[PDB]
Coordinates of C-alpha atoms in Angstrom, one line a residue:
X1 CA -9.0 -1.0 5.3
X2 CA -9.9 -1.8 1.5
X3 CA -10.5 -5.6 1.9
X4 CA -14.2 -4.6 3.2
X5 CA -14.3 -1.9 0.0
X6 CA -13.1 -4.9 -2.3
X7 CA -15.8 -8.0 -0.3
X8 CA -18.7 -5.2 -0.5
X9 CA -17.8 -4.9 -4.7
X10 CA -18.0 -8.5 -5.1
X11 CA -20.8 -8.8 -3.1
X12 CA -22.7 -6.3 -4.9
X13 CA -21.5 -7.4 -8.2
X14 CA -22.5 -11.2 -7.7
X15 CA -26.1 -10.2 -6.4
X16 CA -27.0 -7.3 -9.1
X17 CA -25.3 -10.0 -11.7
X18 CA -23.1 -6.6 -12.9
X19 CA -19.1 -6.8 -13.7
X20 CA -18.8 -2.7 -13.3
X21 CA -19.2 -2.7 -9.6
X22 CA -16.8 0.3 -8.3
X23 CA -16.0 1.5 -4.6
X24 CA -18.3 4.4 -5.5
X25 CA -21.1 2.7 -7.3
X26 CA -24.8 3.2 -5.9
X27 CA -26.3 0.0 -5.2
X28 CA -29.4 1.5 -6.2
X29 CA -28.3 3.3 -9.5
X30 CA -26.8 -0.2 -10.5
X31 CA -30.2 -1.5 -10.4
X32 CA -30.9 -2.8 -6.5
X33 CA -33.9 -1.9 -4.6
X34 CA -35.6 -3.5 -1.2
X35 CA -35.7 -6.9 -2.7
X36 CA -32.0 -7.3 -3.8
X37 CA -31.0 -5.5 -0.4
X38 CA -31.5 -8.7 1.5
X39 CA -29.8 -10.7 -0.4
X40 CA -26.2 -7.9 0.0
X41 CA -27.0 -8.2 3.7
X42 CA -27.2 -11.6 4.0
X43 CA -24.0 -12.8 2.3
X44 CA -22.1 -9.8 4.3
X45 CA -23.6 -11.4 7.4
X46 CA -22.0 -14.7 6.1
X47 CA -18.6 -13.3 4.7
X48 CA -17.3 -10.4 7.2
X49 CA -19.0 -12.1 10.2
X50 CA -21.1 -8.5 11.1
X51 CA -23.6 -7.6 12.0
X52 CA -25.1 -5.8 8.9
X53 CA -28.6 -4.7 9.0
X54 CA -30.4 -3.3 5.7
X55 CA -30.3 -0.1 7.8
X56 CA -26.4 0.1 6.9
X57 CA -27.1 -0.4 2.9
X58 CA -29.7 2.2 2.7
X59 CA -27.3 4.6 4.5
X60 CA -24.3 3.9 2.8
X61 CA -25.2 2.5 -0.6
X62 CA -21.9 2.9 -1.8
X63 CA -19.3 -0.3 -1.2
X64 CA -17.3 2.7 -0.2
X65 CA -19.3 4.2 2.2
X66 CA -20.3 0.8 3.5
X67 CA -17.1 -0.2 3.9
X68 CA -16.2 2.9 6.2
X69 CA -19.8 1.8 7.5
X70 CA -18.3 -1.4 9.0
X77 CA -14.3 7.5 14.9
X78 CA -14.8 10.9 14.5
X79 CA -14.8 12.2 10.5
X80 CA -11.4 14.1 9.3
X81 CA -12.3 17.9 10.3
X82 CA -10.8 20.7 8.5
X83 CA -8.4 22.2 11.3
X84 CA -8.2 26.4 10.3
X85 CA -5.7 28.0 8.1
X86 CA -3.5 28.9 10.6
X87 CA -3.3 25.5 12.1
X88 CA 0.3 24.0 12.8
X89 CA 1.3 20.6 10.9
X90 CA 1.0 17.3 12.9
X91 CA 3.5 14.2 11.8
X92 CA 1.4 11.2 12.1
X93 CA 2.4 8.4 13.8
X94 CA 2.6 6.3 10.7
X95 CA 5.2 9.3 9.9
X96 CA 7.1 8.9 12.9
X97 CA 7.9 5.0 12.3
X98 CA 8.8 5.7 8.6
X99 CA 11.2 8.4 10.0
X100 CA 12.4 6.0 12.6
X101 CA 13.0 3.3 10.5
X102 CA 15.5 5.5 8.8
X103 CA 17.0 6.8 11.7
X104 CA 17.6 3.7 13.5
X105 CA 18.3 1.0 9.9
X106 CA 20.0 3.5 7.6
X107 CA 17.4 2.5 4.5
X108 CA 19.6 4.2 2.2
X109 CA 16.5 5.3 -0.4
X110 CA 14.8 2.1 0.0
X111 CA 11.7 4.0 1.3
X112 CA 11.6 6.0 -1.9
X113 CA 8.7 5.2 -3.4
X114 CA 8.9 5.9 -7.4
X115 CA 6.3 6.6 -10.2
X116 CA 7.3 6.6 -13.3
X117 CA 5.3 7.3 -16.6
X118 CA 6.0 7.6 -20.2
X119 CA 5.1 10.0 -21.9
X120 CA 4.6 10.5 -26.4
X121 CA 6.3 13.9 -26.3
X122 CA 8.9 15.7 -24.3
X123 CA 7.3 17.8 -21.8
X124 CA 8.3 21.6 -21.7
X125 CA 10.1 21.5 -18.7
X126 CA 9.4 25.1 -17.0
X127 CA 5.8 24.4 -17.7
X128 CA 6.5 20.9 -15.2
X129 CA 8.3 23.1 -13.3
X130 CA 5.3 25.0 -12.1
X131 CA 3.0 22.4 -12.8
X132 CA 5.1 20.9 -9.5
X133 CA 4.4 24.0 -7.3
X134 CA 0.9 24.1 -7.6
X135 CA 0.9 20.5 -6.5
X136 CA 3.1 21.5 -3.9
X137 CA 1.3 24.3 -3.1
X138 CA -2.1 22.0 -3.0
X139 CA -1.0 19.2 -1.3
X140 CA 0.6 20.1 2.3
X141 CA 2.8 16.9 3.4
X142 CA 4.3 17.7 0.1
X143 CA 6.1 20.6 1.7
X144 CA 6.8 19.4 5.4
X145 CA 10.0 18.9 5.9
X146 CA 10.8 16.7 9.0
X147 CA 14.0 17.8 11.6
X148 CA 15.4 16.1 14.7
X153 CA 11.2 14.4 15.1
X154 CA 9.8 17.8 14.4
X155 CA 7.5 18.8 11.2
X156 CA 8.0 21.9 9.5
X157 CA 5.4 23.7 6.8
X158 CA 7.3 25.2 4.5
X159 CA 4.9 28.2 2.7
X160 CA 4.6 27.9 -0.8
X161 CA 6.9 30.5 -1.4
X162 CA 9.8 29.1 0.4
X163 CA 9.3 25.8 -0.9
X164 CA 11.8 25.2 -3.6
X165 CA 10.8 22.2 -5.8
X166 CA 13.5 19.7 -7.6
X167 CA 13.0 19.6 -10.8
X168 CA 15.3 18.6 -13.9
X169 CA 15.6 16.8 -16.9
X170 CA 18.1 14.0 -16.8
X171 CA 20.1 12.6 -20.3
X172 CA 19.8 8.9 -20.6
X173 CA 23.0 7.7 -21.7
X174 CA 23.1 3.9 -20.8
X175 CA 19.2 2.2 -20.3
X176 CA 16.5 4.3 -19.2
X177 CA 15.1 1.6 -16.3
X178 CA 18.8 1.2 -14.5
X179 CA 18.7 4.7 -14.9
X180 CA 15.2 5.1 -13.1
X181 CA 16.2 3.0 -10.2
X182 CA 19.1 5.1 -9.9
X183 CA 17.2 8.3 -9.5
X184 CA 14.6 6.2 -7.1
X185 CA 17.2 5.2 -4.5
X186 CA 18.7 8.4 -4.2
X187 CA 17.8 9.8 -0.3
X188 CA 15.9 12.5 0.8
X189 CA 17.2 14.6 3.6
X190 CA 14.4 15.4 4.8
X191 CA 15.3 18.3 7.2
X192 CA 16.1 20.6 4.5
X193 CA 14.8 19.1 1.0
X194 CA 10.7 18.5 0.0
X195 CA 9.8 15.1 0.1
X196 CA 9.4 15.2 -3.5
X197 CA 12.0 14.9 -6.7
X198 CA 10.9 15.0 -10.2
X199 CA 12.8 13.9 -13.0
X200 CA 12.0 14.2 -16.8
X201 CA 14.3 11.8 -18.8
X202 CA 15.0 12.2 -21.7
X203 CA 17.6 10.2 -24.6
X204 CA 18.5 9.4 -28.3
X205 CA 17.0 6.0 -27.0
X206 CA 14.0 7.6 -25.4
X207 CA 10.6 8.6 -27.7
X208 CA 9.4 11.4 -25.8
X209 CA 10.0 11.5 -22.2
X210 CA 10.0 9.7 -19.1
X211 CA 8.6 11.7 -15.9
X212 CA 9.7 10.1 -12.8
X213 CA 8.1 11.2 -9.9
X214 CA 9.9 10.0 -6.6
X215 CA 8.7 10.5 -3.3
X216 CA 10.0 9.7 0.4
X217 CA 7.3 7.5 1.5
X218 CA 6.6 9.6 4.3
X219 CA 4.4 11.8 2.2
X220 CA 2.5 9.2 -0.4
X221 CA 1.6 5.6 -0.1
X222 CA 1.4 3.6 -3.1
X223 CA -2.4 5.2 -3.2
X224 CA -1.5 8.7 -4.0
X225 CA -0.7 7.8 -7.4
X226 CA -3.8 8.5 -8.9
X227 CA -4.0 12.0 -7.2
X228 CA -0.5 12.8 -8.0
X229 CA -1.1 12.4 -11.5
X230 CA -4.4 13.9 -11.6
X231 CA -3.4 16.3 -9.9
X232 CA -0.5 17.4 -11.9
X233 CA -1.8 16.9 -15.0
X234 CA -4.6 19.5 -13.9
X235 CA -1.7 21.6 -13.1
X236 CA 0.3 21.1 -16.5
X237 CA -2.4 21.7 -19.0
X238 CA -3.1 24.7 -17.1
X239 CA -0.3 26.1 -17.0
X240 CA 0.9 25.1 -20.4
X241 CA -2.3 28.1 -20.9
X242 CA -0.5 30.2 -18.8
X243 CA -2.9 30.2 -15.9
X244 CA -3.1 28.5 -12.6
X245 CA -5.2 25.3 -12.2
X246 CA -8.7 25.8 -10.9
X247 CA -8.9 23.9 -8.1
X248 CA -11.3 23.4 -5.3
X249 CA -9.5 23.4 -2.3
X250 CA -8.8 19.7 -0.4
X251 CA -11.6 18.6 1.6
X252 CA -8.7 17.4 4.3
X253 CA -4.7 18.2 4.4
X254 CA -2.8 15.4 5.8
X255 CA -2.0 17.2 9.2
X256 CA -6.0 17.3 9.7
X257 CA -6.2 13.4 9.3
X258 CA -3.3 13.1 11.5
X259 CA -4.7 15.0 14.4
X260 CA -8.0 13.7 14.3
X261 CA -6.3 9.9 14.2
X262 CA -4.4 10.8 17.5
X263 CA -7.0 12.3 18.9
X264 CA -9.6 9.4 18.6
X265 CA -6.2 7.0 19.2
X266 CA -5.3 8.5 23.0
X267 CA -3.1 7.3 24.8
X268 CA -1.9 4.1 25.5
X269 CA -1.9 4.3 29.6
X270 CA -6.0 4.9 29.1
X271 CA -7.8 1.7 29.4
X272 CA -10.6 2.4 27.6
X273 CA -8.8 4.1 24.5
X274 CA -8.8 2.7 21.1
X275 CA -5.0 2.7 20.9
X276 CA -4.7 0.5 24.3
X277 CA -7.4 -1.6 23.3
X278 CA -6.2 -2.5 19.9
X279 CA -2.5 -3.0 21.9
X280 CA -3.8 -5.7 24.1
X281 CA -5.3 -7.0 21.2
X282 CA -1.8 -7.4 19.5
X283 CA -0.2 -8.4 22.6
X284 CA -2.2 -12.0 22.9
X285 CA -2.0 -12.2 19.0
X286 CA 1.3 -12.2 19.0
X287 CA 1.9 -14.3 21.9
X288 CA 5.2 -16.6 21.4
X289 CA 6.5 -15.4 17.9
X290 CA 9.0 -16.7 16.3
X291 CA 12.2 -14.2 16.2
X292 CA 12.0 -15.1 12.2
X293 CA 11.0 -17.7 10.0
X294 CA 13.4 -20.7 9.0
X295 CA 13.7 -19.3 5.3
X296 CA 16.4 -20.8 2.2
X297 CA 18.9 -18.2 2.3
X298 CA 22.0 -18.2 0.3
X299 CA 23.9 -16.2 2.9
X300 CA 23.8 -15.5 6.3
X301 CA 22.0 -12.2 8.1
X302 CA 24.6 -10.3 7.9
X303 CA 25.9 -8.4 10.9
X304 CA 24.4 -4.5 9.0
X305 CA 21.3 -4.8 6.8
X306 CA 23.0 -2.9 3.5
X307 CA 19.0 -2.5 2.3
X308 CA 20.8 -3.9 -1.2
X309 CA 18.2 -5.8 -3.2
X310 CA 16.4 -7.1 -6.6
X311 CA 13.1 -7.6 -7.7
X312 CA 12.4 -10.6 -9.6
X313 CA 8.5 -10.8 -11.5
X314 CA 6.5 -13.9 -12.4
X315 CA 4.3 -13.2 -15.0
X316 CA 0.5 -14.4 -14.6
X317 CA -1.2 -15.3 -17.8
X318 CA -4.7 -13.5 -18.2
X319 CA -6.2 -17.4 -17.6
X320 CA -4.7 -17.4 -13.7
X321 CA -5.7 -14.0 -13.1
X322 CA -8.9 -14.7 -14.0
X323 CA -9.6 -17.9 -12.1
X324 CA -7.7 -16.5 -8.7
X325 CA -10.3 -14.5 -8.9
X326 CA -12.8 -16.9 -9.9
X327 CA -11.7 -18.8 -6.7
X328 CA -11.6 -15.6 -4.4
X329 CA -15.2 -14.9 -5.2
X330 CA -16.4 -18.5 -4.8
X331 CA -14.8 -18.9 -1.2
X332 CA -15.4 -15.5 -0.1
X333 CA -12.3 -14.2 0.2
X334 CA -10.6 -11.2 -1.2
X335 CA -7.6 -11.9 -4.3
X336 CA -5.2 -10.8 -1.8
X337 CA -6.4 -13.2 1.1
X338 CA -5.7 -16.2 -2.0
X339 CA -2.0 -14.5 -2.2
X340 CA -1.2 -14.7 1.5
X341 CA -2.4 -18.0 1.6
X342 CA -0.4 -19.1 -1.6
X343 CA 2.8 -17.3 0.2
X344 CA 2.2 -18.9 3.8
X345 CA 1.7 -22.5 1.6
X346 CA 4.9 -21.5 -0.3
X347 CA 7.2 -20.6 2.9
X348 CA 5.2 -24.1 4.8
X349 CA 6.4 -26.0 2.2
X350 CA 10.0 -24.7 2.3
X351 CA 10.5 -26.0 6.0
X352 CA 9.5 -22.4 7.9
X353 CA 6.9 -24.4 10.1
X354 CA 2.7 -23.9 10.7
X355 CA 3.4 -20.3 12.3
X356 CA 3.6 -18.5 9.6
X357 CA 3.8 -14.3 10.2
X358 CA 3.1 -12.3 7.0
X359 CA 3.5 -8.4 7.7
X360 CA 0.9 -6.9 5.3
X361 CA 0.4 -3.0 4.6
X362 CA -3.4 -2.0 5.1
X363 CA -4.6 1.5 4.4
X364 CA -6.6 3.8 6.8
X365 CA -8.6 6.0 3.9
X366 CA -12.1 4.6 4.8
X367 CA -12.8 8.3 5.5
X368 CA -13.9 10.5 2.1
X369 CA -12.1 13.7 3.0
X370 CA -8.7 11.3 2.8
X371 CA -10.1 8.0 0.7
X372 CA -8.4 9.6 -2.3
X373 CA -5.5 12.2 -1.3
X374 CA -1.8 12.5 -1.1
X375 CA -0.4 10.8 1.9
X376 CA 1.1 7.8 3.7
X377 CA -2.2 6.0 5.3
X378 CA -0.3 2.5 5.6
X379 CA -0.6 0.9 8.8
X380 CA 1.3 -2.3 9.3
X381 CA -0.4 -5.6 10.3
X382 CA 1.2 -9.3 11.3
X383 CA -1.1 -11.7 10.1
X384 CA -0.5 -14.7 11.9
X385 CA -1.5 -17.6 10.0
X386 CA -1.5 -21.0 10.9
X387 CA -1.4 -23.8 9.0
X388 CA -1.5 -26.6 11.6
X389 CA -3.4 -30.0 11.2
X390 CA -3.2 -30.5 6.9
X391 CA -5.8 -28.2 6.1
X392 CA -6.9 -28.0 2.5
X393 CA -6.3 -24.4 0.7
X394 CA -9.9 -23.7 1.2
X395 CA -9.7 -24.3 4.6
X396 CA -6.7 -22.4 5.0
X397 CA -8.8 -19.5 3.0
X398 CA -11.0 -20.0 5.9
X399 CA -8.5 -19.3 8.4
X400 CA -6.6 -16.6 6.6
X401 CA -10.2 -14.8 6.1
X402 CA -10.9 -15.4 10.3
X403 CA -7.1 -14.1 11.1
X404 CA -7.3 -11.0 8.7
X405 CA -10.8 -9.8 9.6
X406 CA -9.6 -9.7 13.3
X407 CA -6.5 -8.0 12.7
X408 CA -8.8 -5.8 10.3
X409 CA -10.4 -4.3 13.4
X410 CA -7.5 -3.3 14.9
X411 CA -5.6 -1.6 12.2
X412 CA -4.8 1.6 14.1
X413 CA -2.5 0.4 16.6
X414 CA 0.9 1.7 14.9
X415 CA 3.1 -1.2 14.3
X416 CA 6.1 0.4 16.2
X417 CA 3.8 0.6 19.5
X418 CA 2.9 -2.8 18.4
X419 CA 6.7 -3.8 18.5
X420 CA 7.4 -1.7 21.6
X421 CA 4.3 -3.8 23.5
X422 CA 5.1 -7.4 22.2
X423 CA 9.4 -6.8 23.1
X424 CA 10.6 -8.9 20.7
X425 CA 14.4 -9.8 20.5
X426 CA 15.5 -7.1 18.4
X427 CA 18.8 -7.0 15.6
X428 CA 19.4 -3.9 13.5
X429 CA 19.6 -7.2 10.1
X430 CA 16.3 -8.4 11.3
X431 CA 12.9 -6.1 10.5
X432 CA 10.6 -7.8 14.3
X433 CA 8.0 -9.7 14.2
X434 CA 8.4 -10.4 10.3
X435 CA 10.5 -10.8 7.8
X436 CA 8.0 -11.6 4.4
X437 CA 5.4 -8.6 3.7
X438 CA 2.7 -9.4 1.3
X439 CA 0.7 -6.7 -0.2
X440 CA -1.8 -6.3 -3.1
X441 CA -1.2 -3.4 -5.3
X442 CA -3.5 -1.8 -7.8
X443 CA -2.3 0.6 -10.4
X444 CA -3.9 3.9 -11.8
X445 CA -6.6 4.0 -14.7
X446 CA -7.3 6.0 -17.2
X447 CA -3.5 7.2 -17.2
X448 CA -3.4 6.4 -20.8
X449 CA -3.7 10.3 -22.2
X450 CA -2.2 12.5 -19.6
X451 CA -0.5 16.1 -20.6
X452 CA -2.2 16.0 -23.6
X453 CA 0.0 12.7 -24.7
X454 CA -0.2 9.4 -25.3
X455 CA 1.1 8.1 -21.7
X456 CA 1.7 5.0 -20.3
X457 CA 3.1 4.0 -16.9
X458 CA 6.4 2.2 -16.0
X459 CA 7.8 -0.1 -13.4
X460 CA 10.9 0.7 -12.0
X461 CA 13.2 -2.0 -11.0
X462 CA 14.5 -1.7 -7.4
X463 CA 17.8 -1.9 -6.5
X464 CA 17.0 -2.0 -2.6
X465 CA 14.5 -4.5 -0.7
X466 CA 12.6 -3.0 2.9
X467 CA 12.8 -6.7 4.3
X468 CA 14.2 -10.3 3.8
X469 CA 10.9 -10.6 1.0
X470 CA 8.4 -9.2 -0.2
X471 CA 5.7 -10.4 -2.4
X472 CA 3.3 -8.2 -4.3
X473 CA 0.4 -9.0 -6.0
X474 CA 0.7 -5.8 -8.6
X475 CA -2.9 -5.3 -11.1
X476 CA -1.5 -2.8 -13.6
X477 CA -5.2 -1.3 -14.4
X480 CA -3.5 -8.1 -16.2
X481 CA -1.4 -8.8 -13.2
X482 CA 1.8 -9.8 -12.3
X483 CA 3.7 -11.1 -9.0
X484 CA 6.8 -8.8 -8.2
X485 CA 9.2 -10.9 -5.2
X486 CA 11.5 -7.5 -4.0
X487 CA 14.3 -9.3 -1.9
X488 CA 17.5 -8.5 0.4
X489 CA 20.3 -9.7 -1.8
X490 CA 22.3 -9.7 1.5
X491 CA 20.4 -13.1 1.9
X492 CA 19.2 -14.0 -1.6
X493 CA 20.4 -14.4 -5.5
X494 CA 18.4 -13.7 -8.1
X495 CA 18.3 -16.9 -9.4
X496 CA 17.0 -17.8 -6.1
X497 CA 14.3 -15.3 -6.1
X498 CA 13.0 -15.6 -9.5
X499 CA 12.6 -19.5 -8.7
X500 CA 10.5 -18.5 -5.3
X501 CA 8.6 -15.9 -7.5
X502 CA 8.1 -19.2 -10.1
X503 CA 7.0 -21.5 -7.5
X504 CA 4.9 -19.2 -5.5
X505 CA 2.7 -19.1 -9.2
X506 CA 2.8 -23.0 -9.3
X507 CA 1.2 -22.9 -5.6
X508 CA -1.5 -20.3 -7.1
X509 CA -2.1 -22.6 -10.2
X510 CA -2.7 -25.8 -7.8
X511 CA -4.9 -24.0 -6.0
X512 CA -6.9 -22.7 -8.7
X513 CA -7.2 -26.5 -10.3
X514 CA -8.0 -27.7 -6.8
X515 CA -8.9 -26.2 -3.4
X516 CA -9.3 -29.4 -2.0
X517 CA -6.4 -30.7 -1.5
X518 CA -4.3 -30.7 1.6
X519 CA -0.8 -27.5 1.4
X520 CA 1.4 -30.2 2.7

């Protein structure tokens, strides 16, 4: 879970009076000592509601490794150990199965690049990532994974002609599917036009081998492998502390089984089972059209700018009620979807990551569980008491993240519709994009945001930092017009401005 990483950071950062607090930043190094440590410990006992001893800072100095601090470590399984689909893999591989997503679980990066990359130089640059990174090469058949060897992996790789725009054109390439029994979970596309200076290199994976977190290490990664081989040598690369198939089977492992009492997995399932008690099927949303009989996946994204000024004091606010930037969000969108009639029981689905572990913390993968967080807004709370609130409801669901959400749907039996994702329909999520991206290849690169033409749900917000920030509303244009989702994107900011200007008065 990264909202512990992202409390620990601005807890170090407020008491060592330092801006440049990172994940990996020694408390000590950064100028803390004995003295200071009391002060981290106590507002950590205040915030997360743990018991955090000084013992815990000294051993993990690190808001990283004290965020882990708060299950056995990956192990290296050998070399000729068999791949092992996680369950997080399963339900994406399910999903498509039993909804027909039609490519709206390809998950796209796209970056521009100064000059027009040699194209059998990317070529090979793509096998040695492929030949690094494992779930890169398992292919998945009826659900069964399959290790393809680097030598019998055959990457896609092409350049593309940009005739009309370049960013239709990149949601184009994005949405088309994967079959994953035969194909790599991995297309790359260089684009390239009379309209286009340089390149773009679009990178699309099926999301059932790289969450939104595997960004930095694809690029890294394959900008190792470029440069190298652009010198007509393979890329000197330690091997991976961890391949996904060893996180996979240690997570089941520790998970068991859900018919043992005592296991994590049943335990965190009985947990969900109260939590979830009395749902409602869906939320009384504005749509323009009914839920149509087939979900089509069709949808839009609509983006509401957020000037430098509001990111600043969302943040300002987050640090001074405790609260993490996205728990602000998910209060803004329950105080949004309140005002719009949808009631005080307001269920947010929200991705969290499992990469607390360092062999996995930065690797390619899918580590996103997902999580309902319930929140209420009953009796006219303020924002900051509803901050309160979210903060309780998301630090209890925090601690059972590992519960998959398709046992959690199989436990809680809701009434199910093929239109209809259970026990949600809005996901928020907070979304942090790469640094130091700026010079890849040995070019002047920059990344760039590809316009969906397919939505996972009825909505879903994201709160996107590029590495400014911007809100991005991705919705089913089965249900919604654009005009209708650029005005919800609009108003969810005006809710975020009010709350900014004042906390203290009542969401009604």
């Amino acid at each position: 879970v990264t909202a512990y990483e992202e409390i620990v950071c601005q807890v170090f950062a407020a008491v060592l009076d330092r801006s440049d607090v990172t994940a990996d930043a020694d408390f000590f190094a950064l100028g803390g000592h004995s003295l200071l440590s009391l002060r981290v410990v106590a507002r950590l006992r205040a915030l997360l509601g743990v018991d955090v001893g000084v013992r815990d800072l000294f051993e993990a100095p690190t808001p990283a490794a004290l965020a882990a601090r708060l299950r056995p470590a990956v192990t290296r399984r050998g070399p000729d150990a068999p791949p092992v689909l996680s369950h997080f893999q399963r339900g994406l591989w399910l999903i498509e199965q039993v909804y027909q997503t039609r490519g709206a679980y390809n998950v796209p990066l796209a970056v521009h690049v100064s000059d027009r990359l040699d194209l059998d130089v990317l070529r090979a640059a793509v096998r040695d990532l492929v030949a690094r990174h494992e779930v890169l090469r398992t292919l998945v058949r009826s659900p069964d994974p399959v290790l393809l060897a680097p030598e019998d992996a055959a990457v896609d790789v092409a350049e593309v002609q940009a005739a009309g725009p370049v960013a239709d054109l990149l949601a184009e390439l994005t949405a088309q599917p994967f079959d994953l029994a035969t194909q790599i979970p991995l297309r790359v596309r260089m684009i390239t036009g009379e309209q286009v200076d340089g390149c773009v290199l679009l990178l699309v994976c099926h999301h059932i081998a790289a969450d939104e977190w595997s960004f930095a290490p694809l690029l890294r990664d394959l900008d190792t492998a470029y440069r190298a081989r652009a010198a007509g040598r393979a890329p000197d690369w330690e091997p991976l502390p961890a391949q996904y198939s060893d996180y996979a089977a240690t997570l089941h492992d520790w998970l068991g089984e859900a018919t043992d009492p005592a296991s994590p997995l049943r335990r965190q399932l009985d947990y969900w089972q109260h939590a979830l008690q009395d749902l409602p099927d869906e939320l009384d949303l504005p749509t323009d059209r009914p839920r149509p009989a087939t979900a089509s996946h069709r949808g839009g994204l609509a983006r509401a700018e957020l000037p430098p000024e509001l990111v600043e004091a969302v943040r300002r606010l987050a640090a001074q009620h405790g609260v993490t930037v996205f728990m602000v969000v998910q209060a803004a969108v329950a105080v949004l979807l309140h005002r719009l009639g949808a009631g005080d029981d307001i269920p947010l689905g929200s991705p969290v990551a499992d990469r607390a572990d360092e062999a996995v913390h930065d690797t390619v993968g899918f580590f996103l569980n997902t999580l309902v967080l319930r929140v209420n807004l009953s009796g006219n709370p303020t924002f900051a008491d509803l901050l309160d609130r979210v903060r309780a409801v998301d630090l209890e669901a925090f601690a059972r993240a590992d519960a998959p959400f398709d046992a959690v749907v199989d436990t809680v039996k809701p009434p199910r519709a093929v239109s209809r994702h259970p026990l949600f329909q809005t996901m928020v999520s907070y979304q942090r994009r790469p640094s130091d991206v700026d010079r890849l290849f040995g070019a002047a690169t920059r990344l760039v945001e590809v316009p969906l033409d397919t939505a996972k749900f009825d909505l879903e917000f994201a709160f996107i930092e590029d590495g400014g920030a911007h809100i991005a509303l991705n919705y089913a244009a089965d249900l919604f017009d654009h005009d209708s989702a650029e005005q919800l994107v609009a108003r969810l900011r005006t809710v975020l401005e009010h709350a900014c200007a004042d906390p203290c008065r009542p969401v009604a």
